Structures are given as structure tokens and as C-alpha cells.
């Protein structure tokens with residue numbers, strides 16, 4: 001099973017200038033809980049944005065060019081990325097935009113955080129047909145002293 005996890009601001013913005021400009025600790029905690037002990041697939045730009053291996057997870061990086069760090073696994077195509085995960089119950093795809101586009105048709109589940117923030121960005125989450133997806137979990141949170149925007153965690157499953 002392939003799942004995508006992402007945090008989206010208004011208008012499906014996911015990034016700007018290879019960064020995420022907001023800071024929502026509660027959402028990073030949700031990201032860690034849902035990815036720990038699973039393989040994570042990311043594109044090269046997202047690898048450079050994170051800047052280090054994510055502990056407790058098999059880190060698989062898509063790039064057309066040879067890898068430059070043996071702490072992670074480098075692959076050259078979608079099919080190779082999936083194969084490098086082995087026989088696990090759930091593969092997590094952690095972006096970015098180009099990678100989400102390629103894995104969306106293959107995904108059975110989306111873990112989405114909707115953030116009530118207006119962000120200029122240059123990267124968007126793919127348009128997804130709403131009729132294909134059933135919302136199985138949602139949880140709304142108001143802003144607090146640690147999280148400066150309201151946010152909604154949602155899990156969707158392909159019908």
C-alpha cells in the first residue's frame with residue numbers, strides 16, 4: 001500500500017523557494033508518528049530541504065543522477081523506489097510536488113494537514129479528484145501558543 005503525507009496551506013501551497021515557511025510543531029509531531037518505522041520516499045529537492053536523514057525510517061531518494069550520501073538509498077525511477085521498500089504494509093511518500101504527482105495514481109491513502117495560512121508559494125500539491133476519496137478521519141485544532149495557525153488533520157482513503 002502506498003500513502004502520501006503532506007501539509008497544505010491555502011490553495012494547496014506546499015512550499016516556497018525549497019522551504020516550508022511556517023512552523024507548526026503539532027503537525028511535525030503528526031508527521032513523525034505516521035511515518036516512524038516505515039520507508040519514506042522523497043524527491044531530491046525535498047531531501048535537500050530536510051538536510052539530513054530522518055531517523056527511524058528507511059530514507060529513499062529519487063534522483064536521475066548518482067547519489068552523494070550513503071546514509072540513504074538512491075533510486076532512479078518510481079518502480080525502483082517501490083521495489084527498494086521491500087514487502088512492507090505501508091510505504092510513505094513525503095513529496096515534493098513532482099513526486100506527489102507521480103505517486104498519486106498509485107496511492108490508496110492520503111494523510112493531509114490543512115493549514116489555515118495564506119502562503120505565497122511556488123509548489124503545489126496535485127489537484128486530486130474529490131469523488132475518488134472518502135474522508136475516514138478528521139480532527140480540527142485551533143491555534144495555540146505553540147502553533148500559530150489553525151489546522152485540520154485528515155485521512156482519506158481511495159473509494
Ligand SMILES: NC(=O)c1ccc[n+]([C@@H]2O[C@H](COP(=O)([O-])OP(=O)(O)OC[C@H]3O[C@@H](n4cnc5c(N)ncnc54)[C@H](OP(=O)(O)O)[C@@H]3O)[C@@H](O)[C@H]2O)c1
Nearest residue numbers: 006007015018019043044045046063064095096097098099
Ligand atoms: N508541505 C509539505 O508537505 C511538503 C512536503 C514535501 C516537500 N515540500 C516542499 O516541496 C518543495 C520541493 O518539491 P519539488 O516539486 O520542487 O521537488 P521534489 O518533488 O522534492 O524533487 C524533484 C526531484 O526529484 C527527482 N525525481 C522526481 N521524480 C523522479 C523520477 N521519476 N525519477 C528520477 N528522479 C526523479 C528529480 O531529481 P534530479 O533533478 O536529481 O533528477 C527531481 O528534480 C520544497 O519547497 C519543499 O519544502 C513540502
Ligand SMILES: Nc1nc(=O)c2nc(CNc3ccc(C(=O)N[C@@H](CCC(=O)O)C(=O)O)cc3)cnc2[nH]1
Nearest residue numbers: 005006007027028029031032050054055094095113
Ligand atoms: N503533515 C506534514 N507536515 C510536514 O511538515 C511534512 N513535511 C514533509 C517534508 N519535510 C520535512 C521537514 C522536516 C521534518 C522533520 O524535522 N521531522 C521530524 C520532526 C519530529 C517532531 O517534530 O516531533 C521527524 O523526526 O519526523 C520532516 C519532514 C513531508 N510531509 C509532511 N507532512
Ligand SMILES: [Mn+2]
Nearest residue numbers: 077078079080
Ligand atoms: Mn522502468
Ligand SMILES: [Mn+2]
Nearest residue numbers: 083086087088
Ligand atoms: Mn515483494
Ligand SMILES: [Mn+2]
Nearest residue numbers: 116117149150
Ligand atoms: Mn492563519
